[PDB]
Amino acid sequence: KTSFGSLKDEDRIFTNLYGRHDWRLKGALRRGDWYKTKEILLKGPDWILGEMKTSGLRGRGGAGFPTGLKWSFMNKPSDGRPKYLVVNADEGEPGTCKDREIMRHDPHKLVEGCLVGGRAMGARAAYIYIRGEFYNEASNLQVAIREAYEAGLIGKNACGSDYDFDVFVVRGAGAYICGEETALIESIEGKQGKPRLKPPFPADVGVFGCPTTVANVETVAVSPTICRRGGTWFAGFGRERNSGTKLFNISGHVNHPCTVEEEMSVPLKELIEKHAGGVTGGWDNLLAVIPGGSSTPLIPKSVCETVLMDFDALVQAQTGLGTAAVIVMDRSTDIVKAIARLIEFYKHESCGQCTPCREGVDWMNKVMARFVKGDARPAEIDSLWEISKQIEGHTICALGDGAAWPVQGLIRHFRPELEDRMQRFAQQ
Amino acid sequence: ASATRVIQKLRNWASGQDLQAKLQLRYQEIAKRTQPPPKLPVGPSHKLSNNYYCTR
Ligand SMILES: Cc1cc2nc3c(=O)[nH]c(=O)nc-3n(C[C@H](O)[C@H](O)[C@H](O)COP(=O)(O)O)c2cc1C
Numbered sequence: 001k002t003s004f005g006s007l008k009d010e011d012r013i014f015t016n017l018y019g020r021h022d023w024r025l026k027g028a029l030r031r032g033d034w035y036k037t038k039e040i041l042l043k044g045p046d047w048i049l050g051e052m053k054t055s056g057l058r059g060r061g062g063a064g065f066p067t068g069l070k071w072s073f074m075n076k077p078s079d080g081r082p083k084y085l086v087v088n089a090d091e092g093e094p095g096t097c098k099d100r101e102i103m104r105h106d107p108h109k110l111v112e113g114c115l116v117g118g119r120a121m122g123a124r125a126a127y128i129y130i131r132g133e134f135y136n137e138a139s140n141l142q143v144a145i146r147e148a149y150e151a152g153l154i155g156k157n158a159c160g161s162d163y164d165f166d167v168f169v170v171r172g173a174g175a176y177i178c179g180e181e182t183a184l185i186e187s188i189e190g191k192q193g194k195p196r197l198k199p200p201f202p203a204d205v206g207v208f209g210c211p212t213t214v215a216n217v218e219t220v221a222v223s224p225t226i227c228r229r230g231g232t233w234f235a236g237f238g239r240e241r242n243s244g245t246k247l248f249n250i251s252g253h254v255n256h257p258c259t260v261e262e263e264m265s266v267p268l269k270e271l272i273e274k275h276a277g278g279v280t281g282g283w284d285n286l287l288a289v290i291p292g293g294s295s296t297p298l299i300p301k302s303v304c305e306t307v308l309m310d311f312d313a314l315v316q317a318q319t320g321l322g323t324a325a326v327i328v329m330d331r332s333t334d335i336v337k338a339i340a341r342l343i344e345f346y347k348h349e350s351c352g353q354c355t356p357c358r359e360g361v362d363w364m365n366k367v368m369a370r371f372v373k374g375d376a377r378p379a380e381i382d383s384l385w386e387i388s389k390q391i392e393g394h395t396i397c398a399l400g401d402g403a404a405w406p407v408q409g410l411i412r413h414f415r416p417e418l419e420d421r422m423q424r425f426a427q428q
Numbered sequence: 429a430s431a432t433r434v435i436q437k438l439r440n441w442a443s444g445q446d447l448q449a450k451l452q453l454r455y456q457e458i459a460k461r462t463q464p465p466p467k468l469p470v471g472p473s474h475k476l477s478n479n480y481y482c483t484r
Pocket residue numbers: 058059060061062063064065067070088089090091092093176177178179180181214215216217219397398399
């Protein structure tokens with residue numbers, strides 16, 4: 001119960017995350033899927049949610065909220081409408097590649113986990129929204145679904161079970177905002193990817209005005225083997241409040257950038273050193289790291305040596321975990337340029353319906369460009385902090401938060417570099 | 429300014445006190461009429477930060 005980050009391959013819940021054995025059915029069936037799914041389904045729905053609540057499985061997307069509670073919001077019967085299950089694969093946040101690398105190389109985990117989630121909840125079918133740029137991955141997935149339909153695992157008798165299910169694959173069109181719970185839903189409905197206000201919640205009224213619970217790829221893909229192996233076993237790894245395995249995408253300024261499944265609450269330094277061998281120039285050459293993709297603030301190397309890769313730890317460090325897409329800077333790169341690029345991205349990917357992210361994100365983009373060039377003065381730094389705090393909790397969706405948090409992470413840990421660039425531009 | 433130094437004396441005696449120094453008229457001791465441009469200052473509430481109208 002102390003200093004545990006390393007593990008073995010019996011626990012690797014993504015046994016083919018590198019496409020080394022097989023992605024089709026014949027080859028996936030060997031890796032422990034579609035095994036006892038009839039027994040799982042007919043065991044009961046509440047048994048599945050009990051396994052979830054005992055596993056302590058938090059949402060492995062951006063906003064980590066405990067599942068079981070989330071999936072139990074539509075255990076109630078239907079008052080004259082069908083129910084649906086939207087699997088989210090608009091993996092648009094920077095640094096995040098894990099959902100791609102499972103979409104290809106292990107689609108059947110996803111399919112059976114989605115079925116299991118539906119029968120745990122109630123669902124006529126499912127809608128696997130996938131990014132528009134993921135054409136070949138989506139086609140691998142469609143082939144897997146076709147093999148499943150042919151083998152008799154889905155449809156009029158889903159592995160028997162006295163329960164009928166379908167699995168659809170909706171295809172996006174290239175917008176990061178369509179990863180949100182509600183923009184995704186409206187895009188499936190056939191409109192712009194503009195989020196809704198929440199309330200209403202998708203479990204009372206969602207896609208097509210019907211109940212839904214949106215879920216990420218791995219959030220469901222780990223469901224069936226959790227049911228198959230218990231919440232005790234999944235909760236045994238990781239701290240008591242945020243447990244389980246975790247895919248970890250690593251990018252930038254490290255010798256061997258990679259995707260890894262690892263034990264949650266592993267230290268960031270253990271993670272970087274074991275897999276994706278040491279950063280360029282070694283640890284001393286480290287400058288800052290972003291643990292999430294881009295909707296999480298910076299880390300200054302002062303709390304990289306004494307921090308666990310968890311929700312609670314990074315929250316204690318005035319930061320947060322999202323999809324856990326580690327990104328590294330190594331003293332050889334302008335950092336304000338990087339964060340200005342992130343804000344340029346968050347400007348391009350805004351929907352625009354709510355005023356703060358419509359305007360203030362463009363404010364911050366322009367101001368951070370001006371800080372890159374050094375054409376500002378330090379009385380604007382706290383002004384821009386105030387602009388961030390205006391944008392934070394004044395929005396419909398959490399893209400304003402994601403735009404405002406890297407800003408705060410830079411102002412909190414790298415203000416003197418802004419000061420230096422300003423005085424340099426002023427002198428010259 | 430031009431009082432020929434004896435009429436100056438007459439008026440300073442009849443009055444009771446020197447008035448060539450404290451004259452009713454203005455010759456060259458006045459602020460001239462075309463001036464440099466200023467730069468007027470700027471009061472508080474121009475703080476650019478930590479300045480919300482609900483507080484002041
Ligand atoms: C702008 C924005 C973009 C998001 N994009 C994604 C995404 O691409 N993939 C994802 O899984 N979640 C994304 N989220 C978080 C979703 O709300 C979350 O994935 C979904 O609620 C499922 O949560 P879960 O991890 O409990 O399954 C995004 C949120 C915001 C505000």
